Design a protein around this nucleic acid. Structure first.
Lengths: 263, 263, 263, 263
DNA sequence: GTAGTATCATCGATAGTGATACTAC
DNA sequence: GTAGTATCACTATCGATGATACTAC
């Protein structure tokens, strides 16, 4: 069928409907002029000229340039195979590009390939105010703790965390507890003081320090001192995850720690 | 350069702008929820979902069997290599489809191409556009050559037509082949060698000649010369069937041939 | 009016409708949360979250990351001014790009710059049949002649050509007329023999030549000898414009021409 | 080449695919009718007309009164130079519009920013995304500085804020500026350099310090550090107003400051 | 109606950009 | 209701491609 011939030329050889109908006509009728083509095909008369001129450049037709151009079809066995061979050459190029593209992309993404898995995760700063949320955040910090826990506490933070502190120490994370001397009686026969006497965690006391902090593996949790709101459980507290910043606080802690006294 | 990565992905790996961005984001942050992606990247918030699902579908990102709100990138080393290997398969199959379409067309058109003889005949001049289409006519010249074949190849007059030349030589056609010296390197790597050294034909090389041509019996094929035309793959080539015109060109060929090397 | 404020932010500072309404809201109400933003603006509740996060990256808002994020507007005098200067630097870049682009384009188009103006067009091959069109083409050739006219004629002239040959010769174009001896008596009172004797043009006679031709300034006009379409007279004739081809015929003409004379 | 030209034209000179091609064709063949263009080029025949008219309008081609429709290219040296010069004009006017839109917005928002005193106040921690937006906060820090300013600039903490620094010094704020040695070579003249020799401030250079910062009274501004974040212009910067936290950072500054050179 | 010129119209893919639906409290 | 989530629908550009005037007769 000519319908089938037209379909195939469109589907596999990059000819539009009109160009395809034209080339079939040229093959069926041999030599045609734009005028003749129109009479023996469904190619619109107005379009015959450019459509045939289109087959010309694509290699499906040869031509005689004159007052009225006449066209002959190239032999389908020559052009169709030519098309395929050329196509394969394009493919062969598009392929090599893809490989060089791949090689380069891997070189570009080299520095970015990240094994670490974010748990929050794009967030490295978190602002907490309530007493509920301040505890839920310390809980997470102690749970995700894998290396060291440094706790300089002015009050309830260390007494309420005891359950969570113990569990962490059990996993093998180095724990250092630093309290204000006035808070000691709050730890009567507590499992912390028990662990401290065993050697499973370091415990020390200081009369005072101005910047209490919780440190967990490059995570620091501190408060913005407001005694006004500190009565109001709505005291602002900040969680920051960064090697540099947390390292700055760790220095301060070590300053405290090297001046305190173990129980 | 994130921009270069996005560019490459869009070009050689069939990702849209957003998907390309999303993948680099995925590769960068290791894990991302749709909202997180909308934040750190330039992918429209409302598009992050379909963009991420799309990447997953294209095998560029994965979702855990758990709460599927988080997406992780597939490692570039794996995903990029897999795309290229898979792509080769898709093209290879399209090749088969194309070949099947060609063979079918040749079959469908068989009845059309009968001894007429043929539908296009008695025409002694045709024009062919583009040096790339040179062989679409010269092939016919070689298949019908009965007496003599005189080729002064520029490297495009009779590309990949060697089989027809040796076939012509077999049916008793005298063949003189004149090549530019830069062509010889692909006779290694030939079939006319050892068909030339056998004496079944002649082969001579030459540094420079201004009028490359193919003569077959009383037919001459030559290309015109226009810088602008060739930039647009539109160079004009002419086929003339005339004993006087051919004879003139043959005088020029002979001129070239008496200066060529017997190599 | 806020409508006016929103209009300006969209028009000049690259904010969509929602982001623009948000920043106006933030400026009006100071600190807002996504929920609050919705209550005091026409920003859809579902969109507030991502829209505010958008103003964040764009530099129109600062934020407190928490269970419920709160946002403050950057001061319009800082952001709006910041935007403009940043924009100016992008412009400064796109400009430098444009200049380099131009420089390169001029280097690429250097070989392509065409001064000559085609009076026929892209066609360097023309196929003519009949006497009407072959004469109109010879006339055009003689009119456009500016350097030399080489005419080896097998018959005709002054078949309308005396007038055109003379007029050309009047313009100062070197003319060479070559007729077959049998044609000499046809021009005994012709203006050509008159001009030849003066001699404003060279005239010579030959008993025979197999390839008559008209040459005009790198244009050649010849016939494809067909027994006996010349009688019909549907004899195919070809016009070719090309230095190489025309030089080939010119060599042939000189072969003829070196065999005089007009007498 | 031709593909590269088309690429440039589309990129830097605001031509669509067809117009860019058409222009290169116009430059190549010197003159072209819509049909001729449709033939030699990849511009769809039915589109050649509007495409050529378009090129003319954009000042890339010119047309004769007819009767035929032939187009000539404008010389690239002229058209390309004209586009760029005109473009500079176009942007320069949009800049004015932007400045005018800004000035108006500040006016419209003036009533909004009334004595609250600050719309946003009593807030002691804010986050700012992207190093590019650093000054959108630090600016406020410097303009409100009453006692002390300690800058350890990385080159982005206080970009283009020199005027505010010298201005702060005038109202009696003690100013210490610590810069990396690679920054100093670009401080010419400047007001910050002949303010130190005058003694109105101090300036010390240092090869390397890990924690660039800005301290103003009881306020600190510092940036976190994440490669992935910075690739997406999403780096987190923090502003904290707390005497204990700032004092800590100040200890670090003083550490940096005791190793720098007086320049 | 016929030749040959110039001109329009429909559509898919992509990327923006102004809005809803579903859902567990 | 509240606070989220998960998608929707629409617009504009453009390059592809099929159809249709106008002007000669």
């Amino acid at each position: 069928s000519k319908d089938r011939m037209v379909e195939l030329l469109q589907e596999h050889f990059e000819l539009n409907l009109y160009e395809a109908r034209a080339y079939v006509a040229l093959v069926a009728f041999g030599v045609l002029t734009p005028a003749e083509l129109a009479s023996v095909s469904e190619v619109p008369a107005p379009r015959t000229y450019d459509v045939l001129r289109s087959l010309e450049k694509k290699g499906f037709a040869m031509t005689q340039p004159g007052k009225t151009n006449k066209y002959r079809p190239v032999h389908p066995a020559n052009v169709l195979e030519k098309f395929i061979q050329d196509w394969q050459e394009r493919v062969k190029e598009e392929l090599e590009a893809k490989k060089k593209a791949k090689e380069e992309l891997l070189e570009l993404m080299a520095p970015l390939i990240e094994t670490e898995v974010p748990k929050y995760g794009v967030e490295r700063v978190w602002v907490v105010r309530g007493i509920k949320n301040s505890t839920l955040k310390t809980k997470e910090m102690l749970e995700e703790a894998q290396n060291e826990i440094l706790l300089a506490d002015d009050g309830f933070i260390a007494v309420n965390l005891e359950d969570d502190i113990i569990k962490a120490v059990d996993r093998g994370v180095k724990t250092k507890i630093l309290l204000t001397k006035n808070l000691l009686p709050r730890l009567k026969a507590s499992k912390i003081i028990d662990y401290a006497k065993e050697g499973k965690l370091e415990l020390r006391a200081l009369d005072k320090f101005d910047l209490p902090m919780l440190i967990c593996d490059e995570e620091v949790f501190f408060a913005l001192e407001d005694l006004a709101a500190r009565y109001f459980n709505y005291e602002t507290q900040v969680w920051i995850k960064d090697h540099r910043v947390v390292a700055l606080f760790k220095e301060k802690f070590n300053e405290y720690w090297e001046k305190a006294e173990k129980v």
